[PDB]
Design a protein around this ligand. Sequence first.
Ligand code: BCL
Ligand code: BCL
Ligand code: BCL
Ligand code: BCL
Ligand code: BCL
Ligand code: BCL
Ligand code: BCL
Ligand SMILES: COC(C)(C)CCC/C(C)=C/C=C/C(C)=C/C=C/C(C)=C/C=C\C=C(C)\C=C\C=C(C)\C=C\C=C(/C)CCCC(C)(C)OC
Ligand SMILES: CCCCCCCCCCCCCCCCCC
Ligand SMILES: [Ca+2]
Ligand SMILES: [Ca+2]
Ligand SMILES: [Ca+2]
Ligand SMILES: [Fe+3]
Ligand SMILES: [Mg+2]
Lengths: 42, 73, 72, 73, 318, 257, 272, 41, 42, 41, 44, 43
Amino acid sequence: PSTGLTESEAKEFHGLFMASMTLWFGLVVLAHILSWMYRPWL
Amino acid sequence: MNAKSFDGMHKLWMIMNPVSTLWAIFIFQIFLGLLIHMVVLSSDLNWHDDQIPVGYQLQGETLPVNLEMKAAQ
Amino acid sequence: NAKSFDGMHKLWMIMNPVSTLWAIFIFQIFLGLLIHMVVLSSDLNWHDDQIPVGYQLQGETLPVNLEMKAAQ
Amino acid sequence: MNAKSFDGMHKLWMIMNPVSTLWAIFIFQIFLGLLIHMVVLSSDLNWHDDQIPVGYQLQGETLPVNLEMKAAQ
Amino acid sequence: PEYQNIFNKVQVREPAYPGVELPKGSLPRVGKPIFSYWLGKIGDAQIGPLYLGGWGIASLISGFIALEVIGLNMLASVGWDPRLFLKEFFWLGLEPPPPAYGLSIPPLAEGGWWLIAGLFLTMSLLLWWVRVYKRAKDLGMGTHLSWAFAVAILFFLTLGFIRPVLMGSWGEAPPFGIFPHLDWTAAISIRYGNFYYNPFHGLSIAFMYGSAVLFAMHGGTILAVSRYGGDREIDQITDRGTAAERAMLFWRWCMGFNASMESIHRWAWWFAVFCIINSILGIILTGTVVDNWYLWAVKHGVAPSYPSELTIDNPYLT
Amino acid sequence: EFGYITQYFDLAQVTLWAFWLSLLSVIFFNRREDKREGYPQEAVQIFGKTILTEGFPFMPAPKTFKLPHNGGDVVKPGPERPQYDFKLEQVDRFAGAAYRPVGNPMLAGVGPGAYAVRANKPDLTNAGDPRIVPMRVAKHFAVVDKDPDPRGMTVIGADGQVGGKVTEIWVDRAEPQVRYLELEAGNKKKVLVPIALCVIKGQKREVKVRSINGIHFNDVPTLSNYDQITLAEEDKVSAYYGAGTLYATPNRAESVL
Amino acid sequence: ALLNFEKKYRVRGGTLVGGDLFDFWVGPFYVGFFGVSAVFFATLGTMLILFGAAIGPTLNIWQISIAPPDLSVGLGFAPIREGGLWQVITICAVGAFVSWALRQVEIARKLGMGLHVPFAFSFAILAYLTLVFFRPVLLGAWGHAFPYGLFSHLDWVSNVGYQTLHFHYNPAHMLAISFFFINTLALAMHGSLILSVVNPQKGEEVKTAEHENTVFRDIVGYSIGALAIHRLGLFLAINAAFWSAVCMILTGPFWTRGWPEWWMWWPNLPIW
Amino acid sequence: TTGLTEAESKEFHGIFMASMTLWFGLVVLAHILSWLYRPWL
Amino acid sequence: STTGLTEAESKEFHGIFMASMTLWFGLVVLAHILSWLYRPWL
Amino acid sequence: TTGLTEAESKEFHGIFMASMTLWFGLVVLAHILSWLYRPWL
Amino acid sequence: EKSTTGLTEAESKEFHGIFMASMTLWFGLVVLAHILSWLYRPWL
Amino acid sequence: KSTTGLTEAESKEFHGIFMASMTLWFGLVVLAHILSWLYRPWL
Ligand code: BCL
Ligand code: BCL
Ligand code: BCL
Ligand code: BCL
Ligand code: BCL
Ligand code: BCL
Ligand code: BCL
Ligand SMILES: COC(C)(C)CCC/C(C)=C/C=C/C(C)=C/C=C/C(C)=C/C=C\C=C(C)\C=C\C=C(C)\C=C\C=C(/C)CCCC(C)(C)OC
Ligand SMILES: CCCCCCCCCCCCCCCCCC
Ligand SMILES: [Ca+2]
Ligand SMILES: [Ca+2]
Ligand SMILES: [Ca+2]
Ligand SMILES: [Fe+3]
Ligand SMILES: [Mg+2]
């Protein structure tokens, strides 16, 4: 415990971190689909 | 292994500080956002100055009122 | 995927609320100034586009100013 | 809810200092006032030098007394 | 005469000091401290240890990538010969893109390496900023050193990124050399009509002269009362002794007003920062608002007017 | 046309005004911070009455330093400790005249021999220990060879006479360096001399102290406990050596040319 | 007015010239023989600058100018309207600057302290004397010095610089600029550090010397010390002034080509 | 943290909101006058 | 407890924070609809 | 916080508002005269 | 005497397991990106 | 005397793994160069 978090606290943080990152990447994908529909670059 | 190889992963936050990491991630994301927008604006894909769907400065120079005033001088 | 964000309110037990509020406000003001300046430097500029009319040009061609400039 | 969600808002002043905040707001507003006036004065919307409703330097150069004095020279 | 206190006559050693304890959760400090006799003749003799965390490693990776790029292009400009590199070293440089390319990304040997080195140097300085801030704040001190550093970074970004973007060309930025960057300085003065008639340039020169004056005055005054324990400024601030009293009487009697042992450091701070603030303001207006500083100074009633006696005929009018 | 003008008002002009106003305003704030020590000042009136004046701009509101290791609070601008008991006679009958010491000038505490009234506690390290200590209390220090060890040398005193002999070195633990030399004088007392008033000659094995005379080393102020020094005592010692720069010889205060 | 603690330090003695006649204060100032001299010379110089502005074309503050003689006068004496006024003012200026330094010495002697400040001022004085006395004497004419005028001494600086095609390549000029830049950097860091240690994070105690050492050893790996930074300061400022004086005594008297051509000694070493 | 109780905070909030509303009203009025005199869009 | 807020205080703050952020984003959307009606940029 | 009681604050507020009103009155008068002499819009 | 990190042998084994798994996954993604790029714009 | 605190057994262990790793690295280098020579010979 070099950060002072126990294993339960780490599990909790990890759960919410992974959920948030997944939601963020979803929004990124949506932005790119719109951009491809408007101005395809490849 | 290869199915349950990433089960210890939650222990990451017992060696890395969560709040420091959050702040680092946010700052890096903002910097990268600004950078990619500036890189795409400096290419052929630029969307502010492409005069689509219309050029507005040129539209203002050729209004009938402005033309009639510029004729009178 | 609907019970994933339950513990979210605990965010404020590790991040200071007042510092975060101030950071957000300052960042938003800086970004507001920046985007206004970036759009004013483009073809979308709305102060100098002479729409709906050019005002300096309007002042140069007033009949009183024209008649005074003719007497010179 | 959509009406009762801003109830505890008044507690804002239990974590933010009211006097500091007031001073910050006032100073920021004055700075922004000066800035917007200067930004609009540097555009086509300028209202001091547009020579409307009349040009005053030009009016002074063509007064009959000044013209008659400049003719005698 | 009397001892002037310029060199240490007798030196003493104790075991190295590892440093004030950091908050829990920190990385250890790297290095075993060594001692320098020659550095100890004039100052502190210990070298190291050093703190390398997250931000100061990303910085130092960025900076060294940038340095490798700059060095290799300077070396390619002489045909890879290290003998010629040492021979003509002050004349070599990495040059910006040709101005006709605008703000696009040019090919690599016609300005793209300049662009790469600029990007990596920028990132290096911003990561270093975060390091300086956190290092001062983790020990519980005020963050005054980060404010001044921010001002300096802003001047580096103004001449180099902000002004070239506002002008529409990367070819308006300095190159990476010694004589090449001096040439850039002279040319930008010649093109925009004489920087001596830029008023922000005059004000920053006022504050650079003032920095030298003020620091000669302060360094002198504290060495002159170090016999009464004046070099220990924190104690003279929180418990005013005779050293501070004599130091403030000297200036009061000499020029009519004085500062205190804590206030003189605010004067120092500001004199060093106004120099660079005026630097930013003077560069940001050149070219984008004013096209000839001498004609500006003539329009606002500033330039002298030497007597003529002759007439020279402009041959473009004939 | 080479110098044609389109418009008189521009941005450079306005920005220059703004700078004139942003300076002119840090001057104000710095001048106010300058007056947290030594104020309100004392203005002498037409016929001798003294009032407290405050200057332009006025004094700031007090701020607090919180000293470490329960070393108390310091408010500034705040009260002052009382002066001691200097005696002085004015020389000419006007407010701007100079003063003369009344008794023995060396033992008077006026002129370059004045000192301040500090706390009667030692200065501390980050751990709570006294900062300036003799090298027998700090058992980990050593003089670097390559340098003349002053322990043993004599203390010639500016007129050629001997003052005493060096017996100890006083070090600074927070920043390792020498601060004082301790010596035994002619009447067998232990007195200190600051290292910044000593010229050390290794080969002659002498320490020359140009400030005071040889017989003057008998009257240097002494310490309470010889395992530490307090702020007050530092001031007294240093001030005694500084009084000799003008009072040692009767010819020192007497117009070079 | 006197400070709270000032009265016990206002004693007599410590002077160089004069004696007990000029040993008094006027308000906060200390006068002395050299105080009288300095104010005398400053007043006279100022009034002569103003008169030289009155006989010129304008009293605009930015466009006043008093110029030195022509080069044909040599090291002689010029008419009042064509150079002699400049000579009288440049005598007054020297008188005032030296008076200032000696008054400083008197004050420091009275307060019991070392003579570091007048000694550092001496190098500014030396740079001025290089520009008005030494360089003109070596080149053979007073008309090689600069005129007295804001904006008008800047025209002098510009044209003198371009008499060597590119003055940036002057070696002593490079060295002096190095010292100027490093001095501003050092002053910023010193100011910041002391302020930071006595104004800590809200609700903390004043920090110590150990904190001062630790912060710079953490950031950079080396800390110079609280007494050596004052030394480093005196050193950088004095060196800036010194190498400025050298760079001007080299230009004209000892080198008449372009300054880039001097550097040609380096790539012509027979060792590459 | 600021020493204000909940009643004092409620009081301050009341007056703060009233003042901000009045200020924004004056801003809107200034812009209506400017649009009548010199329309910019 | 690193910030000294309990769990109830954090819940309260979170409620009002989310409401405020939603209102701000609503105003942003409205500004962009007006701008698109006046001067379309894509 | 400022040492003023509520009565002292009421007194100060009375005179402050009166003075500010008089100042703004004088400003309005100056602008009416300037508009009569040299209209700028 | 010798430089150590305070990890026992069990902790080192654990860290090593997860480190190797993560590195393998990262390299897999890199290979996939390059196959797509070769299909779109071959460079050799 | 300058020393690292490793005994002789620890040194033997470290040396074994160090030599294995270096050999594997050099093998990969040789493979990269054979491919490059097949594609674009430089001598
Ligand atoms: C031709 C190219 C397209 C374009 C293509 C893309 C593509 C592709 C992307 C963007 C993305 C973004 N674009 Mg875009 N974009 C264009 C023109 C613009 C213009 C403008 C002036 O023209 C602006 C101001 C924007 C601004 C933005 C941001 C909203 C966003 C980057 C956010 C970020 O950096 O998060 C960094 C900050 C954090 C990660 C902080 C952590 C999370 C914080 C706390 C929450 C912030 C909320 C976030 C801003 C989204 C809020 C929306 C709500 C869900 C309703 N774009 C043009 C038209 N743009 C990216 C995006 O939308 O991400 C989803 C993206 O992938
Ligand atoms: C085209 C012109 C050339 C150029 C031509 C010259 C010339 C010519 C000179 C310099 C000199 C200098 N140049 Mg150059 N220089 C150029 C570009 C630069 C650039 C740059 C960023 O490009 C920099 C940073 C410099 C920097 C410098 C300094 C090294 C030096 C000025 C300091 C000095 O002289 O102190 C010395 C200080 C003094 C002379 C001050 C005297 C102080 C007196 C004693 C006290 C006065 C008190 C006053 C009257 C009291 C008023 C009292 C009121 C009550 C307040 N130059 C360009 C390329 N440069 C000057 C120099 O080196 O001279 C020695 C010099 O002559
Ligand atoms: C084409 C452009 C128009 C123009 C368009 C606008 C528009 C649009 C606005 C202004 C606003 C302002 N204009 Mg205008 N303005 C023009 C020309 C001028 C000229 C001039 C020399 O030509 C001047 C001197 C002004 C000055 C002003 C200020 C009165 C005001 C900025 C207030 C501020 O910064 O508060 C900031 C400071 C604070 C908030 C601190 C606290 C203030 C307290 C509460 C008291 C201040 C008194 C207040 C300014 C006026 C109240 C007077 C009434 C009797 C209540 N304008 C030209 C004609 N102007 C703004 C305004 O009117 O606000 C309502 C505004 O929205
Ligand atoms: C062609 C381009 C359009 C234009 C397109 C846009 C678009 C799109 C947007 C703006 C937005 C803004 N525009 Mg606009 N805008 C134009 C021209 C102008 C001009 C001018 C002089 O020409 C000015 C002065 C403005 C000013 C503004 C600000 C009111 C606002 C930026 C807010 C901010 O910075 O948050 C920074 C500060 C904070 C976030 C602090 C948080 C909130 C705090 C508590 C208080 C803020 C009050 C807020 C400023 C006002 C809203 C209150 C309402 C009366 C209810 N625009 C031109 C005509 N503008 C933004 C906006 O409206 O936001 C909703 C926005 O999305
Ligand atoms: C075309 C332009 C007009 C012009 C248009 C305007 C307009 C519009 C205004 C002025 C205002 C002023 N003008 Mg005008 N003015 C012109 C030419 C001049 C000339 C000149 C040399 O040409 C001068 C010297 C002045 C001077 C003045 C000041 C009296 C006054 C600003 C006061 C101030 O700063 O208060 C700030 C200082 C304080 C608040 C400190 C406290 C003041 C105390 C209480 C006492 C001061 C007395 C006060 C200044 C005058 C009132 C006294 C009466 C005799 C009863 N104007 C030309 C002719 N002028 C302003 C004004 O009249 O104010 C009411 C104003 O609104
Ligand atoms: C013609 C060339 C191709 C191209 C050829 C390639 C090739 C080949 C590769 C990329 C790769 C990447 N490309 Mg590409 N790419 C193109 C155009 C783009 C554009 C754009 C604006 O045009 C963008 C923004 C990107 C951006 C990216 C990144 C997603 C990715 C780099 C990851 C990284 O930096 O390491 C960050 C690494 C770390 C921080 C350490 C390890 C990561 C760990 C596990 C934690 C980080 C979180 C997460 C995994 C981050 C990556 C997100 C994805 C899930 C991979 N490419 C064009 C069309 N690109 C690389 C990639 O795919 O990696 C898999 C890669 O090999
Ligand atoms: C015309 C020239 C050829 C070319 C000829 C060569 C030759 C010859 C060599 C390389 C080598 C390399 N080339 Mg190549 N290369 C070309 C174009 C590229 C391009 C590109 C964008 O064009 C890239 C990104 C690369 C990248 C690389 C790296 C993978 C590698 C250097 C590794 C290193 O520095 O380890 C330094 C780091 C360490 C020693 C630490 C330990 C290593 C870590 C753990 C893993 C690193 C990657 C590893 C070797 C590969 C993954 C593991 C294996 C799949 C098992 N080449 C062109 C097409 N290149 C070298 C190499 O691959 O050796 C193995 C090599 O000898
Ligand atoms: C042989 O040597 C080896 C390889 C072994 C290494 C040795 C290294 C050596 C000897 C290096 C010598 C270096 C020297 C002498 C360097 C001289 C440097 C000087 C004096 C430089 C002076 C000024 C340069 C400046 C001010 C540059 C400013 C550039 C900026 C701010 C760049 C901005 C670019 C950005 C932010 C990127 C934008 C790109 C993008 C992608 C957004 O565009 C769209
Ligand atoms: C009433 C008796 C005193 C007379 C007044 C003193 C006048 C002083 C003389 C003027 C200055 C002297 C000129 C040279 C001074 C030294 C140069 C450094
Ligand atoms: Ca478009
Ligand atoms: Ca418009
Ligand atoms: Ca008008
Ligand atoms: Fe200092
Ligand atoms: Mg070049």
